Amino acid sequence: VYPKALRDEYIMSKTLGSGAGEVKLAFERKTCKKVAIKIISKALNVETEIEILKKLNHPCIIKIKNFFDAEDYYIVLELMEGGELFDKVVGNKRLKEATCKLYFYQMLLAVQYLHENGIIHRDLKPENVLLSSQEEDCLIKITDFGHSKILTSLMRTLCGTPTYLAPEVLVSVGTAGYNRAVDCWSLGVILFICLSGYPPFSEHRTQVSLKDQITSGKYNFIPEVWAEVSEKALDLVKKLLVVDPKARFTTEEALRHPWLQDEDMKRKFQDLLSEENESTALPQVL
Amino acid sequence: VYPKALRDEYIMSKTLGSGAGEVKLAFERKTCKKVAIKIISKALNVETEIEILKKLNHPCIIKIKNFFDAEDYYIVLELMEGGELFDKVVGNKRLKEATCKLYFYQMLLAVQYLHENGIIHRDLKPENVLLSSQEEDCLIKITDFGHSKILTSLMRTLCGTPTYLAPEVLVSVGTAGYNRAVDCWSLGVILFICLSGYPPFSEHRTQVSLKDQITSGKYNFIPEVWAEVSEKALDLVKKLLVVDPKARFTTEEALRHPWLQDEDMKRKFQDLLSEENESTALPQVL
């Protein structure tokens, strides 16, 4: 059975998805509104995630409504009726380039916001991008902060004299503080897949190991599929899939890239925004 | 003033040392015995250190007796009347090679024990090696676990498919799990200094940066001083001061090194051991 404290406030309903975590539809008794409830079976992963989720406040980042610590973990969140981005791209399905742009722009904003706030997601992928409605033009939100990391001991070590300090520590100074680039790489992969309908790196019809494809950065380019796609878009992908994390495009550089200087897309986003907001906008001093 | 709960059990006495932390002599009321009390001015560093200290049990590792969380932190420990190894090597003072060996052997045991127990010290140096008495032949103990680290997310990342995984993460797999080598490097530096009376790497009478001396591994070799020293000893130093952490000697390899196959030194250690133990040895089934 469900915990009594949960049952007190919510009527549990259908399973929306499972599950490595399960997500169920629920109704908040007080409002009769739909919510999502994530059930994580029984720890530190979760308190981190909760505390991270509580502190974050961005339109393209999932918001937590309630939390229950019981025989299992129960996280109550705003419902994303549109489901996973995964479903929109599975089986070589592919979005209009312009839909890619609208989605990708939001992802970039979300991840930029995470980075400004010292948080690295570390598990960005189509299954962790949720759509807010069943419309093709909607708001997206990043979810699943279980692998996240809060961005040191290196700095403290550097404050003193290295008399006893190991060489590898001094060598790590060259690259320290670029952990956030892993998110930009993932975003690069996600965008590749959204644009093209297929994975840049995979074991499909190739003898190169997955590992070797990735560390060499030799993605699978299929001209016939990409010919349909603009060159501005493909150019952005190529700057995200840079092997050297110090050279890789950051979220800011990506947001300043020509493919995203598109005022039509940006208007549509601001629209969906104010649209979502209307129901909760309190009056204000003019 | 000192906390009432501390004062209740101990009479505070002279400052033994300060302090970046301060250490005072104290007397336990109940036994009238001398203890040391470390005063760390006001956090996570400390709970870690305490919990680490509570769990460890080795003759060459400092033992905690009591702890007080107040306006400041108060750690009560067994008193080391011999003071810091630092004092024995400052101003080009140098120990008989045989004293070096006895000391170094204990350090190796201590650090080997830490590594077996998933703990990396990360701040080994002569000021964190304490002597148990004023005798030249005594027991040594490692102290100061404030920078320690408990030895992953890499493993968890490797369990899945790297479809979205960044190149630098896959590249880090080659060297993952060798963090403990930093302790062996430090031990190498400490042994160099003990044997020779001077630092392997420093800004003294040289134009090479300290950083460059370390990452290149070009220690300062002065034949006149080292001529006095055996070649077995210098050979061990050279295997500890290896730049590549994967090639660097571990504690086990160091303990198996010819310089430490010395049954006379080992007897003297077992003696000091049973000697320390005599006062607390309970009777036992024959």
Ligand SMILES: COc1cc2nc(-c3cc(F)ccc3O)nc(N[C@@H]3CNC[C@H]3C(C)(C)O)c2cc1OC
């Ligand atoms: C509409 O249909 C669906 C709605 C969904 N809503 C949320 C959802 C998750 C939140 F954290 C917050 C609000 C939400 O709506 N999460 C789903 N699934 C997750 C997302 N990460 C992977 C996956 C897994 C394995 C955990 O089940 C949904 C899957 C659906 O169909 C498969």
Ligand SMILES: COc1cc2nc(-c3cc(F)ccc3O)nc(N[C@@H]3CNC[C@H]3C(C)(C)O)c2cc1OC
């Ligand atoms: C006998 O004279 C001395 C005894 C000492 N005993 C302990 C001591 C520390 C413990 F953690 C446990 C038992 C002990 O005895 N620690 C000292 N000093 C520390 C060691 N790390 C650096 C240094 C500093 C900066 C913290 O003061 C002593 C310094 C002395 O003279 C300078």
Ligand SMILES: [Mg+2]
């Ligand atoms: Mg979540």
Ligand SMILES: [Mg+2]
């Ligand atoms: Mg200590």
